Amino acid sequence: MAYPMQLGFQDATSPIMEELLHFHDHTLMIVFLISSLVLYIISLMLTTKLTHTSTMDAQEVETIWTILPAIILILIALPSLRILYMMDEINNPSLTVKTMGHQWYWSYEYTDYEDLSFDSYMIPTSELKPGELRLLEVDNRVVLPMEMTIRMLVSSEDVLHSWAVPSLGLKTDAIPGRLNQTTLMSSRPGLYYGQCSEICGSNHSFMPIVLELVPLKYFEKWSASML
Amino acid sequence: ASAAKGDHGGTGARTWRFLTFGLALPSVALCTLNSWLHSGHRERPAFIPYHHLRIRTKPFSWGDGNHTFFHNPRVNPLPTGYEK
Amino acid sequence: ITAKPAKTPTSPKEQAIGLSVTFLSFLLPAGWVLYHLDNYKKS
Amino acid sequence: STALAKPQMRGLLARRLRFHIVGAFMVSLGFATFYKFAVAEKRKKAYADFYRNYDSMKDFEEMRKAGIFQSAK
Amino acid sequence: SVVKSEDYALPSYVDRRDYPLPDVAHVKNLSASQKALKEKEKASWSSLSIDEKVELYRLKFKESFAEMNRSTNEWKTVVGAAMFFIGFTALLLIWEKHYVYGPIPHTFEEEWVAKQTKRMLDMKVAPIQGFSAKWDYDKNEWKK
Amino acid sequence: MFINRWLFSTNHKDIGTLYLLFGAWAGMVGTALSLLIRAELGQPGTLLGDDQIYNVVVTAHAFVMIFFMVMPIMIGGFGNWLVPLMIGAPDMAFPRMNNMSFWLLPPSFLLLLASSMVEAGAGTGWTVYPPLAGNLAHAGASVDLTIFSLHLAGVSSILGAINFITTIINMKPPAMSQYQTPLFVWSVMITAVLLLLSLPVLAAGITMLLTDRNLNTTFFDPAGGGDPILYQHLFWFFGHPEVYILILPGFGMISHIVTYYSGKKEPFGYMGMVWAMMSIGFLGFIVWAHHMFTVGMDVDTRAYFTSATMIIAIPTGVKVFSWLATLHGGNIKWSPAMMWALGFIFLFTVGGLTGIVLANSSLDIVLHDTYYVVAHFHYVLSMGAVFAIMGGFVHWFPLFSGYTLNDTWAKIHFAIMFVGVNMTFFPQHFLGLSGMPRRYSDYPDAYTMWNTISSMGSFISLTAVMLMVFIIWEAFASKREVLTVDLTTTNLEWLNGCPPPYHTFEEPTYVNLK
Amino acid sequence: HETDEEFDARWVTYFNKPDIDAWELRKGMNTLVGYDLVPEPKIIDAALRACRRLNDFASAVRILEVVKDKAGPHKEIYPYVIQELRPTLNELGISTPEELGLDKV
Amino acid sequence: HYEEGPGKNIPFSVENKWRLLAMMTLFFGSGFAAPFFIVRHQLLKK
Amino acid sequence: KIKNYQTAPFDSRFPNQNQTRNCWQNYLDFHRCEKAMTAKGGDVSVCEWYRRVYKSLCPISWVSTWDDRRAEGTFPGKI
Amino acid sequence: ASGGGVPTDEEQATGLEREVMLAARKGQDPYNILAPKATSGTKEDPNLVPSITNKRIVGCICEEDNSTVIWFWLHKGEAQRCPSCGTHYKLVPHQLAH
Amino acid sequence: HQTHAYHMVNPSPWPLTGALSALLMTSGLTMWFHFNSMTLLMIGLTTNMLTMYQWWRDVIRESTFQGHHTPAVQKGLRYGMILFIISEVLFFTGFFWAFYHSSLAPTPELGGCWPPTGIHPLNPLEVPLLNTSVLLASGVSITWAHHSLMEGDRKHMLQALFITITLGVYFTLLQASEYYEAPFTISDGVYGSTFFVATGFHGLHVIIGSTFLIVCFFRQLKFHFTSNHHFGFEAAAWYWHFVDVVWLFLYVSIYWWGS
Amino acid sequence: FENRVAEKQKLFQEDNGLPVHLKGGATDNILYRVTMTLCLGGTLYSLYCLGWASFPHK
Amino acid sequence: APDFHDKYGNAVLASGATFCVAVWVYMATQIGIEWNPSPVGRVTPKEWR
C-alpha cells in the first residue's frame, strides 16, 4: 500500500512489477533528458541581443530532429515490448481463483476442488479496530498461497469494475459476460491492497481488495475452514 | 466480367434509355416473377422462450409497452408466447 | 502596437471598485451555498 | 594613442549557438546520468541486496507472531 | 504630430531595432524656421550646429535607439502584484477551512497514527525502499 | 436592428464574436465545476455527502470544458474571425448554415444542464460507458438528455467542418495555392477534416446507446449477445481524434504568436509545419485502443497500438523544434501573448512526454485509471489548449475590439495562472505513481498531503479567472483606441484596421501569377 | 550562395548607385540589419555617402546607431567601426550619436 | 447600414463603464453560480 | 487414470487474456459427452476431465444459469 | 418528338451569374475570377491593378514557391513597390463600372 | 459594392428556427421515451418541416430567380455536398462495425454461432434480391434522366425521373412489407438490433432521397433547370447513388453473408 | 405547364429593400410569423417541462 | 517624468511579498490543516494488538 508523501511506485511484491520499476526508471531518465534539453534551449534563444531575422534553410537540421527521436523511441519500445510479452508468457499455474465485481463489493470463488466462495466488503470507518486503515480494510481477505503462480479470472455480475493490486503490477477490467485472465505471483508473504479502478457508480471509491499471502500449508487449512 | 455488349461511337440519353428498357426494367420483371412464385406460407416457427430474444429492459413507449412497432401476431411471439 | 490615450480614463479609485465588485460577484453566491452546505445534508 | 585591432564581425549569432549547443547536450546528459546513478542503479542494488538475504518463511513467521493474518494465528 | 485611426491604410511611423528606417518621417509639417533648417541641410553638415543636428534627427525619428531600448521597473510591480493576489487567495482558504470543512476522521488522531504506523511496520510495508526499509527492527527505532 | 444583426447574422465576424461570448460563459461554468471537484478532495472525508453528485460534477466538468469552452472558442471563435480575414475571403462559404452552427450550441448546453437537474443527474464519466450508463444502472432521463446534447453539439461541428473546408479550398485568391496559406488556416482545415470523419462515428455509438436504453436493442448487452467493449471501440475511435482536434488550432495560433513577437516574417520550416500537422492528423486515427490497455485485448494488438502511438512524438517533435528555431535570432518583444506562448511550448512538452510514458501498454497496466492520467491530460489541456486560448485572446483582442488591454495587468494575470495550474496538477503525478484511482470522492489517508496542495493551487487559479474578467472590463472602460500595428505586411488580418469594417474584401485582394 | 568578399562588394555597389533614391536607401539598410553580422565599414561608408547625396543627415546618424545595436554584447565592435570611418565622418560633417547626446535616456 | 467602429460591433453597450460593470458581473456571475445551485438543488431533492 | 488434477492447464486453443470460450467449450464438451455416455448407459467418468476444467474456470452464476436453461429447454448451445 | 423544352443559360441566366457569363464572352474579368498575369513590373512596365476606389490590397508572392505573401495597400497615384522584392504596381481606376 | 463573385446572404431567421426545432425534437423524444407524451415532438417536427421548407425555398429564390449562383458559388456547393456525403458514410460505418463485431465473435449467450439459435433469417434470394434489382435499375434511369436534361430534352428527362421515383417507392413498399412479414424483431437480441437499425436508417435515407427527387421533378416541371446549370439535380443523383451503394453493402453483409 | 421564370425573376429582383425570405409578399409574412410563434411557444413549453421534471413526483 | 513603476515599484514589490509570506505561513501552520506528513523519524510506533 502507499505511505504518506510517496512520490513513485509502491515497492514491488512481484517479478513483473519489479521489472516495470526499472523500465520506468529507464523511461523517466529519457523524459528528464528531453525536457531539461528543451528548457535550456528555450532560454538560450531568449537571452541575447543579437539578431538574425531574414530567412533560414530548413533542410540540414530537420534530419537531426527526425532521426534522434526515432532512435530514442526505439530505445523505449524495445524493452517495453519485451515486458509486455512477458506479462503474457506460458504460465503453468497451480491454482485458479475467480473474482466477480458487484455494486459494491467483490466476491471470490475457489472451485478447483471444493465449491468455495465469499464476499469481501470494505470495513466502515465507524468499525475500524485501532491500527486499521481507512477505506482499505475488508472483512474477508483473499487468502492465497505465496510463491506460486495463480490464475486470476476476473468478471462482473453487473456494471464494469476493475480489479487492481498496484504493488503486484495487476490491473484487469471486470466486464459482464467476459472472463479476463491475469496472472499473479507474490515473492513475499503479507497484506497487499488495491481499489476498484473503473467508475462503477456512487460507491466506486469503496470496494477495496486485500490479499493475504501465506504458505500453502495455512492456505489449505484456511480454505477447508471456509467451506 | 467487364462487359458482354459494347458502345462509344454514338450515343447519349439514347444509349442509357436503351439500358433502362433493355436491361434494367426487364431484370426487375424477372426478379418480380421469381418472387411471385415463392410467396405464401412461412411455416410459423415453434416457440421456445429463449432468454436472448424477446428482450424487454424497458416497456416500449407505445401500446401496452410490450408490442414492437411492426408486430405480427402470425409470426412474432411475445415473451410469454404467441397470441390469442 | 500604439493607441490613443484613454477616451474615459479609469482611475485607481475606479479600478479599486471594478476589482472589488468583480471579486464579490464570484465569491458571495458560492460562499453562500458553501456556508449552508450543512443545512442541505441529512435527509 | 594606438589603433584597435579588427574584431570578428560575422556570424556572431551562429558563433554563440555552436558554443552552447554543446553546453545544452552535456547539461542535458548530466541530468539523465545523475538520475541513473543516484536512483536507478541504487534501485537495482536495493532489490538485489534485499532478496539475497531474504527468507520468506522467517518473514512470514514474524508477521504471524505480530498477529497480522486472518488465516494464520 | 498626430496619427488618426483612419490613416490605417497609409504607411506609418515605427521605432524598431530591426526596422531602423521607417516608411515616413516622424514630423511631416515644418514651420518657417524648420524649413530654413531643412535648407541648411542641403549645405555642408560642418556648418550645422549640434542643436541643429539634434533638431534634424528629431524631425526624422521619434525615439533614439538608446531610448527605444530603455529597460523599466515594471517587473517589480508585476512580481509584487502577483504575490499580493497570491497572498490574498490564502484568505479564501482560511475562510473555507473555518466555515466549510468539518472535522477530519479519527484515524488522524495521534494515538491512531502511532498504532497504525506500528501495524504497518509489522506487516512490513515497502520493506525494500519505501517505508519499512527505514525502520531498524533490531534497535526498534528509525534508522539515522 | 438588434434582432437582424445578432439573431439573424450571416457575417463571419459577428458570429465569431457570439462564439467568444458563449465560450467565456461556459468557461465560468467549467471552472466552478472544477472547484467543486477540488473542494471535495481538499481534505480527507466527504464534503458533498453524496457520491452520485460528485460523479455528476466530474462528468459535467469534462463535457463543459471540451464541447462548450475549447471547441467553440478555438474553432467557432477564432476560426470564424480569422480564417476569412487571413485569406481575403468576403465571408465564409455558407454564411447562413454558419449561423445555425452557433445557435445549435445554447440548446445543446441547455440539455446538458437539464440532465444534471432531473433525477440524480448523469454520473457516468464523460466516456459514458455501459452498463453503468444503461437503463438499469442509470434509469430515467439524465443519460438520454446527455446523449441529445452530444447529438446537437455534433451536428454543429459537422456543419462547421464542412463550411471551413469549403471556404478554405474554394475562396482563396486564384493565384494563391494551399502552400501559400497561413499556418492557422492549415490548422483549422486539418481540424475540420478530423471533425468530419470522427464525429459521425461517435454519433452512431451514442445512437446505439440510446436504443439499448429505449428500444430494447442489445448492442452493448451480453444478455442479448451484445458487448460493452464494442461501445469503447466506437467512443475511442472518435475520442482520440477529439484530443487532436482540441490542440491543432492551438498549434496554429502558437506558430503565429511566436513568429510575430520574434519580429519574423514567417515561421521556420513552413512546409515541415504542414507536413507535421497532416501526419498528426493521420496517425491520430490509428491509435484509439491505447485507451483500452486493461480490457483484455490480446498481446499482439496491444503491441501494435503502443508502437503506433509512439510514432506521433516524431511529427510533434519537429513542431516544437521549429518554434524554438523561429525564436532563434528574433527581436523578442516580451508581450503578454508571447509569455503564454513560451509557457505553452514548455508545458505542452512535459504533457506530451508523460503521454509517451502512458503509450507503453506494459506500464499503463499500473497507470491506467489513476491520477497519473489526469495529471498528463491537464498539462496538455489546461496548460496546452488554454494557454494558446489566453495567448490568442490577448494578441487579437485589439483587432476584435478596437481597444487595448493593459499590459502590466495582463502580465500579472499570466504569473498568477502559471503558479496556480502548476501547483494544482504537478503533485498529481505522485498521486498516480502511488496509485490513487481517478474519479474518487475520497482516498486512503496516505494520499492527503498531495491532495491538499493540489486543491490549494486550484484556488490560486480562480483568482486569475477573476482577475481576467476585471482586465477585460478595464479595457472596455478606459477605451484606449488602437492606431498602429506592427508587421502588417505579413499579417493580412490587421490590414483593414481595428476593428475591421462589417464587410471586408468587397473588392478582393490583387495577387499576380507571374 | 556566395563568399564574404562577394557579399561585401555587392552591398557597396548597391549604396554607390549615383542616383539611388530614398526608398532604395531604406530598403538596403532595412535588409542589411536582417543578417547575422555587423556590416563592414566599407559598406557603412558607402551608405553614409548615399545619405549625403540624398541630403539626409538624420538617416546617417540612424545608421550609426544600428551599427552599434547589431553588435549587441560585443562592445569592441562599434569603436573599431568608428575608428575606421573617421575620415568620412570628418569629411562629411557627420556627428556620432554619442557626440549628439542621443545615447542617453 | 450597421454601426461600425470600436464599441459598435458587439451586442452589448460600452457607453457607460458602470453599466458595463453590472452587465459583465451578471453575465459571468450567473455562469459561475450555476453549478453551486445545481449541487444545492440535488441535495435538497433528498 | 491420468487426472492428478491441480487446475486447468494452459490450452493453446485459448491463448489470450480472454477466456470466455474456454469455460464455454468445456461446458459444451462436458455435456455432449454426458449425452453420449447416457444414451448408451453406465459411466460418465470418461467425460470427467471436462467437468473438472469448466468447474475450475466458469463462474458459478454462469454454470447455474446454464444448468437452469438446459432443464428449462432454453439452452442455446447445440448439445 | 425528342425536342427541346429545356432552357439554356443564354436564355435564362440572370443577375450576377449573367454578368459573369457575358463578361467572359468578351474575355473580361470584372468579378476577379481569374489570376492576373504579372508583367515585368519595372518602372516603365508596372503591374496595373484595376479598382473601383482609390486603394486596393495587393499581395506579392515575390518568388514562385514562397510560402509567404507580402500584403499592402496600393494607393491611387505614382506607382509603388513591393516592400519585399521591389516590383512595381500602379492603380488604374474603375473600368469594371466607370 | 462587390467585385468578387460570391454570395453575401440576406440576414435570415431560419438558422435560429432550425436550432430551436432541434431542441424541440430532442426534448420531445425525451418526453416521449419517459413521460409517454408526444406534444413536444409534434411541435419540433412541424417547425423543423417549416424551417426546411423556407430555407430551401430561399436557396431557390437566390439562384433560379436572383442569379447569385455564379460558378464560384457552384464550385462551393459541389464541395459541401461531397463532404456531407462523406460524413454520412462514416455514420453508416459505425453500424457496419457493430454488425461485423457481433457476427464474427458470437457470444455464448446466443449459443455461440451466427445467426443465433432461434433466429430464422429472410431468404436473400427472395425479396432482398428483388429490392436489389429495383435500386440498381433506378441507378440506370437516373443516369438516363441526367443525359436527357443535358441534351435539353424536357420530355424524356421527366419520364426518366418519374421512373426512378416509382422504383424508389416500390423499394420502400417492399421493404415495409418485409418488415411486417419478418419472424424476428428489433428486440430479438443483437441480430434484430443490428438488422433493424442498419436497414432502418437506410430506409430513412431512401425516403429523404425520394423526397429530394420529387422536389427536382417539380422544379423541372417548372423549367428551373438549364441544360447546363442544375445543381439541385446533381446533388440528388449523388445522394441517390450513395443510397444505392449502401444498399449493396447491406445486402452483401447482412442478408447474404450474415444469413 | 408553361415557362414563367422571367416573371418570378422580375419579382425577386425588385429593388424594395425586403430580405429574400419576405419578397414573396403577404404569404411569406404569415408563414414566417407562424413558424416563429411555434418556435417560441415550443421553447417556453419545454422550459416548463424541464422545470417540472426536475422535481420528484411522489 | 518617471512612470508608475519608477514611483511605486519598490513599495509594491515589498508589501506584496510581505503580505503573501505572512498569510500563507499563518495559513499553513495555524488553523489546523492536517498535512499528514511522513511519520518516519517523527512518530513513535505503539502496540495495536
Ligand SMILES: CCCCCCCCCCCCCCCCCC(=O)OCC(COC(=O)CCCCCCCCCCCCCCCCC)OC(=O)CCCCCCCCCCCCCCCCC
Ligand atoms: C513544472 C514546475 C514544478 C513546480 C510546481 C510547484 C509545486 C510544488 C512541487 C515542486 C516540485 C519541483 C520539481 C522537481 C522534480 C522532481 C522529480 C522527481 O521527484 O522524480 C522521482 C520520481 C520518484 O521516484 C522515486 O521513488 C525515487 C525517490 C528519490 C529518493 C528520495 C526520496 C525522499 C524525497 C527526496 C526529495 C527530492 C526532491 C523532491 C521533493 C518534492 C517536491 C514537491 O517521481 C516522479 O516520477 C514524478 C513525476 C514527474 C514527471 C514529469 C517530469 C517534469 C520535468 C521537469 C523539468 C526538469 C527541469 C528542472 C528545472 C527547475 C525548475 C524549477
Ligand code: HEA
Ligand atoms: C490536448 C489533448 C491531448 C493531447 C495533445 C494528448 C497527447 C498524447 N497523449 Fe493523451 N490524453 C488526453 C489528452 C491529450 N493527450 C486526455 C483528455 C486523456 C484522457 C481520456 C480519459 O480517459 O478521460 C488522455 C489519455 C492518454 C492515454 C491513455 C492512458 C490511460 O487512460 O490509461 C495515452 C496513452 O497512450 C495518451 C498518450 C498521449 C500521447 C502519446 C500523446 C502525444 O500526442 C504527445 C506528443 C508530444 C510529445 C511527445 C512532446 C513533444 C515532442 C518532442 C519534444 C520530441 C521528442 C520526444 C521524444 C523522443 C519522446 N494520452
Ligand code: HEA
Ligand atoms: C478542456 C479540458 C479541461 C480543463 C480546462 C480542465 C480544467 C480543470 N480541471 Fe479537469 N478534466 C477534464 C478536462 C479539463 N479540466 C476531463 C476531460 C476530465 C475527465 C473526467 C472524467 O473522468 O470523465 C477531467 C477531470 C478532472 C479531475 C478528475 C477528478 C476525478 O477523477 O475525480 C480533476 C481534479 O482535480 C480536474 C481538475 C481541474 C481543474 C482544477 C481545472 C482548472 O480549474 C484548471 C485551471 C483552468 C481554468 C480555470 C480554465 C480557464 C479558462 C477560461 C476561463 C476560458 C476563458 C476564455 C476567454 C475569456 C477568451 N479535472
Ligand SMILES: CCCCC/C=C\C/C=C/C/C=C\C/C=C\CCCC(=O)O[C@H](COC(=O)CCCCCCCCCCCCCCCCC)COP(=O)(O)OCCN
Ligand atoms: C421503412 C423504413 C422507415 C423506418 C422509419 C419509420 C419510423 C419512424 C422512425 C424514424 C427514425 C428512423 C429510423 C432510425 C431508428 C431506428 C428504427 C429502426 C427501423 C425499424 O423500424 O425497425 C422496426 C422496429 O421499429 C421501431 O421500433 C420504431 C421506433 C421508431 C422510434 C425512432 C426513435 C428515434 C431514434 C432516432 C434518433 C437518433 C438520431 C439520429 C441522427 C442523429 C445524428 C446527428 C422493426 O419492427 P419490429 O416490429 O421490431 O420487427 C418486425 C416484426 N415483424
Ligand SMILES: CCCCCCCCCCO[C@@H]1O[C@H](CO)[C@@H](O[C@H]2O[C@H](CO)[C@@H](O)[C@H](O)[C@H]2O)[C@H](O)[C@H]1O
Ligand atoms: C470555490 C469557491 C470559493 C468560495 C470562497 C468564498 C469566500 C467567502 C465569500 C463570502 O461568502 C459569504 O460569507 C459569509 C460568512 O462569513 C456568509 O454569511 C453567513 O455568516 C455570516 C456571519 O457569520 C452571517 O452574517 C450570515 O447571516 C450568514 O449567512 C455568506 O452567506 C457568504 O456568501
